[PDB]
């Protein structure tokens, strides 16, 4: 139903991070990428709201977190910009949570 793949996104090909004092660290960052055709539907209903949406998107099943390090760094960079915290999993499911935020 859904499909998982690690991919390179415009903003993360490569990713740049700047701290105070202007020292920057760059580096490619692969992201978990879910895609597919979820079963969706919209139906008329009584009362309010008059419509019902079984709307669902292919979302990642978060099971852990990944700390990716940016390699190419300017001299004397802070450590907080040398890493990135990314939610990580292994499979995708049809869920409506991404639509909520």
């Amino acid at each position: 139903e859904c499909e998982f793949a690690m991919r390179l996104v415009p903003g993360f090909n490569p990713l740049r991070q700047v701290d105070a004092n202007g020292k920057e660290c760059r580096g490619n960052v692969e992201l978990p990428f879910c895609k597919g055709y979820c079963k969706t539907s919209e139906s008329g209903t009584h009362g309010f709201p008059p419509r019902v949406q079984n709307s669902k998107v292919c979302t990642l099943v978060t099971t852990s977190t990944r700390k990716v390090v940016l390699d190419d760094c300017d001299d004397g960079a802070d450590e907080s910009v040398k890493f990135v915290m990314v939610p990580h999993g292994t499979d995708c499911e049809c869920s409506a949570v991404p639509l909520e935020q």
């Binding site: 990713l15 990428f33 597919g36 055709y37 919209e42 009584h46 669902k56 949570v97 639509l99």
Partner: protein, 87 residues
């Protein structure tokens, strides 16, 4: 991408009122969607299709109740398509 119109017979069987069968239309199907956790924005980056009714028609009726007839309103689909989930 396949979002199709589906006919639905729906039975109203509420205590006190006459039973009533209502025939309406709903949208059902499968559209493409993808999503990734953007940590730069610390949110979900979503690009999604959903099977929705673009146009619809209201469907009114009288429910013949023993203690006062009611007037009911239902949307029924006329065109089903894969569109933005958030619009």
């Amino acid at each position: 991408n396949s979002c199709k119109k589906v006919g639905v017979e729906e039975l109203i069987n509420e205590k006190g009122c006459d039973l009533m069968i209502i025939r309406i239309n709903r949208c059902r199907g499968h559209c493409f969607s993808f999503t990734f956790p953007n940590p730069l924005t610390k949110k979900y980056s979503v690009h999604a299709k959903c099977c929705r009714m673009v146009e619809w028609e209201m469907l009114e009726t009288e429910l013949k109740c023993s203690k006062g007839n009611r007037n009911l309103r239902i949307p029924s689909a006329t065109q089903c398509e894969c569109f933005d989930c958030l619009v």
